[PDB]
Each structure stands twice: as C-alpha cells, then as structure tokens.
Amino acid sequence: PVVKINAIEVPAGAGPELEKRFAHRAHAVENSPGFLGFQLLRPVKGEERYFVVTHWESDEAFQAWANGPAIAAHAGHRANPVATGASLLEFEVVLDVGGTG
Amino acid sequence: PVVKINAIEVPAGAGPELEKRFAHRAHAVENSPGFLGFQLLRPVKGEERYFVVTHWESDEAFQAWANGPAIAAHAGHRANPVATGASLLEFEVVLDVG
Numbered sequence: 423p424v425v426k427i428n429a430i431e432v433p434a435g436a437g438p439e440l441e442k443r444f445a446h447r448a449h450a451v452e453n454s455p456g457f458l459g460f461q462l463l464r465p466v467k468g469e470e471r472y473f474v475v476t477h478w479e480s481d482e483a484f485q486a487w488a489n490g491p492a493i494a495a496h497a498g499h500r501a502n503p504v505a506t507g508a509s510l511l512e513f514e515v516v517l518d519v520g521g522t523g
Numbered sequence: 524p525v526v527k528i529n530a531i532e533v534p535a536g537a538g539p540e541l542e543k544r545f546a547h548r549a550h551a552v553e554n555s556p557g558f559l560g561f562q563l564l565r566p567v568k569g570e571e572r573y574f575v576v577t578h579w580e581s582d583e584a585f586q587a588w589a590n591g592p593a594i595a596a597h598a599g600h601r602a603n604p605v606a607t608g609a610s611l612l613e614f615e616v617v618l619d620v621g
C-alpha cells in the first residue's frame with residue numbers, strides 16, 4: 423500500500439475552523455476505489471503544518487482519484503481555502519505492524 | 524490518540540539496508556503500554572526522508588517509552604547506524620476514518 427500526505431500550511435488561529443471543515447466532509451472520499459482511509463493530524467511539535475494522511479492500495483488508485491473525481495467534486499462549492507499552501511508527500515509502505523502480540 | 528513520526532535522513536543507496544534492519548526489529552516495541560503500532564514509509568516523491576510513523580494512545584504513553592525503555596534497549600548492541608539525522612514530528616489525531 424501507499425501513503426499520500428497533503429502537508430497543508432494553515433495560518434495560526436485558523437486550525438479550529440480548518441478542523442471543523444474536515445470533520446464535516448470527513449466521509450467525502452468514502453468508497454473511492456483503492457481508498458483505505460485518512461487521518462487529519464494537528465501539529466503539536468516539530469512541524470507547523472497539518473498532515474492529511476491518506477492511505478491507498480496503490481499509487482494508481484490514488485492517481486485515478488486525484489486526477490479525476492477529486493477535482494470534479496469541487497464545482498458548485500466554494501467557501502475558502504484557509505490554507506496558504508500544500509506539499510504532497512508520497513511514500514510506499516515497507517512495513518505496518520500493530521501495537522500488540 | 525497521537526502520532527509521533529521520526530523523519531530519518533537516510534543516504535541514497537542505504538534504503539535497502541535500513542529497511543532490512545527495521546524488518547528484523549519490527550516487533551521491538553510490541554506490547555509497550557499505550558503503543559498502537561507503526562509503519563515504515565519509504566519516500567517516493569516530495570520527501571527524501573523515511574517516515575517512521577508511530578501511533579500511541581497518549582503523548583504520556585509515548586514519552587514514557589521514549590524516555591525510558593526505548594533508550595535502555597540500546598545497551599549491549601552495536602550496529603553502525605546508517606541514518607544521518609532525524610526530526611521528531613509530533614501530532615494529535617483530529618479524525619481517523621476508513
């Protein structure tokens with residue numbers, strides 16, 4: 423599997439509103455092919471950006487969503503953005519273990 | 524829950540060996556209190572560092588481990604470490620959907 427993280431620059435003070443918007447749209451990507459879930463991570467130390475950590479079965483699955491449906495879903499909305507930049511960080515999962523055994 | 528990521532600088536070429544070392548030691552943290560697992564993420568685009576993404580029930584559980592047992596578990600071992608730097612990135616989980 424792969425991990426695609428949007429590392430989003432959020433002005434100081436804007437975090438609560440950004441979190442509210444993500445919580446409201448939390449199920450926006452549900453059932454997209456190859457999609458395995460996401461987390462929104464609020465920065466506490468060592469990073470100032472929020473990390474939007476998304477998980478996919480493959481890079482092709484991610485690319486299909488990001489280039490097609492993700493973009494199309496924007497028409498007929500528009501409130502924001504509060505973010506002032508983003509960087510996509512892309513990775514392959516080498517290992518994934520749980521906490522117990 | 525919280526996420527503590529060690530973002531480790533690995534020299535080009537050293538990735539395979541680093542991955543081998545983590546795979547061998549993959550269950551080193553198992554059953555530590557508050558520990559919920561980890562992933563090792565190999566960088567493909569937009570980052571050059573490996574991300575060691577660890578999951579904890581609380582910051583306190585992480586701090587207990589990092590300051591105590593994680594350090595003590597090094598004695599009586601030698602490997603020449605391949606990484607050339609690391610940054611701990613710390614976060615709180617706002618939402619986690621499947």
Ligand code: HEM
Pocket residue numbers: 443447450451487488489492493495496499500501502503
């Ligand atoms: C510069 C480019 C972009 C801008 C300005 C933008 C801006 C926005 C804004 C304003 C929203 C609505 C949030 C709100 O206020 O409720 C949104 C939602 C969203 N964005 Fe974008 N975005 C961009 C690119 C992308 C890309 C490239 C992706 C994914 C590959 C993406 C994925 C999403 C998703 C999944 C939502 C939630 C949609 C829903 O609730 O149905 N965005 N974006």
Ligand code: HEM
Pocket residue numbers: 426427428430431440443444447448450451460474476488502503504505506507508510
């Ligand atoms: C999968 C779950 C995702 C959700 C629910 C989501 C939702 C959102 C929302 C609500 C915004 C507007 C933020 C604001 O008010 O400033 C946004 C912005 C944006 N998203 Fe995400 N997104 C997701 C994944 C991604 C991914 C993986 C990417 C990268 C491929 C991405 C790229 C972007 C970009 C480029 C923006 C505009 C940021 C800016 O203007 O500086 N999104 N997304």
Ligand code: HEM
Pocket residue numbers: 544548551552588589590593594596597601602603604
């Ligand atoms: C500059 C400080 C550090 C150095 C030089 C260092 C170096 C190393 C080396 C060489 C190994 C063995 C890898 C192999 O098989 O070759 C190792 C293992 C490990 N390190 Fe460290 N490390 C440092 C700090 C830390 C810290 C702060 C933590 C956690 C908070 C940590 C957590 C671990 C863990 C969980 C292992 C797996 C081994 C086990 O305990 O069974 N290290 N480290």
Ligand code: HEM
Pocket residue numbers: 527528529531532541544545548549551552561575577589603604605606607608609611
């Ligand atoms: C929980 C799973 C973890 C495992 C299995 C693990 C394992 C390892 C291993 C095998 C090394 C040596 C890598 C090499 O050969 O260069 C290492 C190095 C190190 N680890 Fe991790 N680690 C874990 C989590 C952490 C965390 C959360 C931290 C954050 C403090 C950390 C801090 C360090 C540091 C500071 C080094 C030395 C990096 C360098 O010398 O540049 N480890 N760890």
Ligand SMILES: [Cl-]
Pocket residue numbers: 428430474
């Ligand atoms: Cl985002």
Ligand SMILES: [Cl-]
Pocket residue numbers: 529531575
């Ligand atoms: Cl590490």
